[PDB]
Amino acid sequence: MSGELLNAALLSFGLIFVGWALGALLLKIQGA
């Protein structure tokens, strides 16, 4: 039980950038 820890770590770190990028995307497609 430490492959699951690092799984949660990686994801909660990485999903932010996906959210960020996806936020950035929506801003471009609106004409900021």
Binding site: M1, E4, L5, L6, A8, A9, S12, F13, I16
Partner: protein
């Protein structure tokens, strides 16, 4: 008890946040906002 999912979320979020804080601090060092400092 050591909860792997929780601990992961803790370690994960502590790192991204510390990272984004330094990133944000930098952004304003290389290009100061009005009244910057």
């Amino acid at each position: 008890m050591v909860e792997p999912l929780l601990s992961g979320i803790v370690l994960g979020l502590i790192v991204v946040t510390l990272a984004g804080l330094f990133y944000a601090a930098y952004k304003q060092y290389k290009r100061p906002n009005e009244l910057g400092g």
